[PDB]
Write a protein that binds this ligand. Structure first.
Ligand SMILES: O=C(CNC(=O)[C@@H]1CCNC1)N[C@H](c1ccc(-c2ccccc2F)cc1)c1cccs1
Length: 137
């Protein structure tokens, strides 16, 4: 078992009718078929769940690349920092942001996320799809 294990991604959104989350311990190829849905203009935070099993780590970073077909990538990096080993998973949350809005904001976006560090370790790399819709349903 590696020292850092990424376990889950959650979109924290007070107005969502239900939990928006994905298990990151499973088959990564199957995560693409699981699309998660955000109402346009919704306020959200990205929450990354992870475990540190053996040794203090430093310089943890969450990197999130968002692709719409035919458009330059929308890139964001977030410093996560230093964490020591413990049985319970940790939770890191990005600052609050707003999903885009308007009919032209709707559609599917293809994300690729990286949980890494200062030593450029590939703790996890994974793809997931986001659908922006006019309504939650
Ligand atoms: O729209 C913008 C730029 N403008 C703003 O982000 C404004 C900032 C304040 N309101 C909106 N990027 C779009 C974008 C859409 C979805 C996400 C996304 C990713 C993960 C989780 C939830 C999300 F929503 C991120 C960015 C595009 C990406 C690629 C081509 S276009």
């Amino acid at each position: 078992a590696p020292n850092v294990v990424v376990t889950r991604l959650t979109l924290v959104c007070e107005s969502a009718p239900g939990p928006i989350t994905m298990d990151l311990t499973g088959d990564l190829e199957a995560l693409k078929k699981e699309t998660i849905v955000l109402k346009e203009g919704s306020e959200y935070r990205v929450k990354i769940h992870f475990k540190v099993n053996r040794d203090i780590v430093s310089g943890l970073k969450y990197v999130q690349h968002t692709y719409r077909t035919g458009v330059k990538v929308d890139k964001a990096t977030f410093m996560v920092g230093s964490y020591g080993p413990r049985p319970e998973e940790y939770e890191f949350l990005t600052p609050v942001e707003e999903a885009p809005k308007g009919m032209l904001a709707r559609g599917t976006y293809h994300n690729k996320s990286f949980f890494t560090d200062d030593d450029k370790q590939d703790h996890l790399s994974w793809e997931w799809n986001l659908s922006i819709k006019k309504e939650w349903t």
